[PDB]
Amino acid sequence: QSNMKQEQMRLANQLCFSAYNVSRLFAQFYEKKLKQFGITYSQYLVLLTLWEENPQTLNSIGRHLDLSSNTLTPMLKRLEQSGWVKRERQQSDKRQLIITLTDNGQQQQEAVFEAISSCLPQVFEELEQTLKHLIE
Template structure:
């Protein structure tokens, strides 16, 4: 079996390329791809716990904490201890984090629509969703 015939290798390469593709757009905002994913999670639902963000992104707290610290330093989010449970952190968007959402989405949408066939993009997304579900059922 050749490496180039392995679906897992193709997925790995596409993932790396998507990260680079997104970071070209996100660099104008001083964001990495991972930081962008945290913001997307918060744009979907603001005021989340560290645990909930970790669950939605499949990231452990030791990976997520440095991302959140950098986002806080850059003014995108605030991290606060929850009074009722000091072990938990509540993460919320700042005004900057809220106000930049539309501009970032617009920049990414424009880049995707200019560089990719949207029908093929959606078909690939549908296939990846099915593959993810199948793999979750196998490894869980």
């Protein structure tokens, strides 16, 4: 048991430190490649889900990105100020706030995808559940 236990801890450290390094490299990569569009990574995530489902209520975006309304509201206005999306609230029923891509916001999807796709040269959900438990 002792020899196998020591080796499992070594493999745990090895894998988790690799991912630890990747967290730093990803942050630099996205900052460098998204600069040309004037958007942050979280803004890019908003555009990411809008390009899959458009339009979307802010509550729908928060459910996709696991982000609160207090987090989305500032940057949703930043994407509207930069011309990516439009904001208009319903006057009945759920009273929700609808986010809709502009014409320019929709066209630029391929250019954004191309700038990011190089992250790879030409399972995760189980770790996300376990890691979240360890942190909280």
